[PDB]
Design a protein around this ligand. Sequence first.
Ligand SMILES: Nc1ncnc2c1ncn2[C@@H]1O[C@H](COP(=O)(O)OP(=O)(O)OP(=O)(O)O)[C@@H](O)[C@H]1O
Ligand SMILES: [K+]
Ligand SMILES: [K+]
Ligand SMILES: [Mg+2]
Ligand SMILES: [Mg+2]
Ligand SMILES: [Mg+2]
Ligand SMILES: [Mg+2]
Ligand SMILES: [Mg+2]
Length: 153
Amino acid sequence: AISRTNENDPAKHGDQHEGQHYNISPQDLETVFPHGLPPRFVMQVKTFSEACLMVRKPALELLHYLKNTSFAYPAIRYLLYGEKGTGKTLSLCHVIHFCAKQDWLILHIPDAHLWVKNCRDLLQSSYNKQRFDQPLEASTWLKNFKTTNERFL
RNA sequence: AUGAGGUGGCAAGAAAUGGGCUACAUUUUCUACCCCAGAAAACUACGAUAGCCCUUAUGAAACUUAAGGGUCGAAGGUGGAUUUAGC
Ligand SMILES: Nc1ncnc2c1ncn2[C@@H]1O[C@H](COP(=O)(O)OP(=O)(O)OP(=O)(O)O)[C@@H](O)[C@H]1O
Ligand SMILES: [K+]
Ligand SMILES: [K+]
Ligand SMILES: [Mg+2]
Ligand SMILES: [Mg+2]
Ligand SMILES: [Mg+2]
Ligand SMILES: [Mg+2]
Ligand SMILES: [Mg+2]
């Protein structure tokens, strides 16, 4: 267990946990992550029968900013960037897991590129005739949004 | 006039056959990208560089030649005997 950590609460992760994997319970995978996890990481959860996420500095830095958030000031925009496959998505998921366990309302868009390509039913909107609706993309997200924030809706 | 010039015209397809091109698809089709993606995937799929219509390019001259677009969505579902090429 040299690569694992017994601290499964993302609110208690610190620099001493860097490089160590913490476990995400199956209950949180169903509620917090009905979507957003990388497709290949989802294959690993099915194969290893567990979801373990390495604690890294990008997420630790961002967790430090969110724990000191001044909710009176306007919302701050944090942007994760880096080369392909460096762990941008999973760093975001580690932060989503922190706020989910702090009773925040999670508005998670797992992949915004899916809303600008490969749309079969692109209907015209009735609320605004100059805009287009996307019933399949919108209904899919509503189902996952309901699963994550069911206790607040 | 078996020579010279002018005007207009033929150069088609019952059929057979040689070579080639494109396909019959999932190691595929479309898009992004040029290789860590998203979709498509059987009668609105794959599949025409064919047919029909229009535009454009060249030209004095274009149903005719070429390019592009629209429309159209066929045979084909991997091919018998035989046979070609490659160290
Ligand atoms: N924190 C982590 N814990 C465990 N595995 C990780 C972690 N970060 C990255 N990985 C591994 O790297 C892979 C890629 O991670 P991820 O998809 O988050 O990267 P990314 O930079 O967002 O990728 P892309 O550039 O494609 O959007 C994961 O599927 C996993 O195998
Ligand atoms: K042939
Ligand atoms: K053949
Ligand atoms: Mg990512
Ligand atoms: Mg004569
Ligand atoms: Mg078709
Ligand atoms: Mg044509
Ligand atoms: Mg002209």
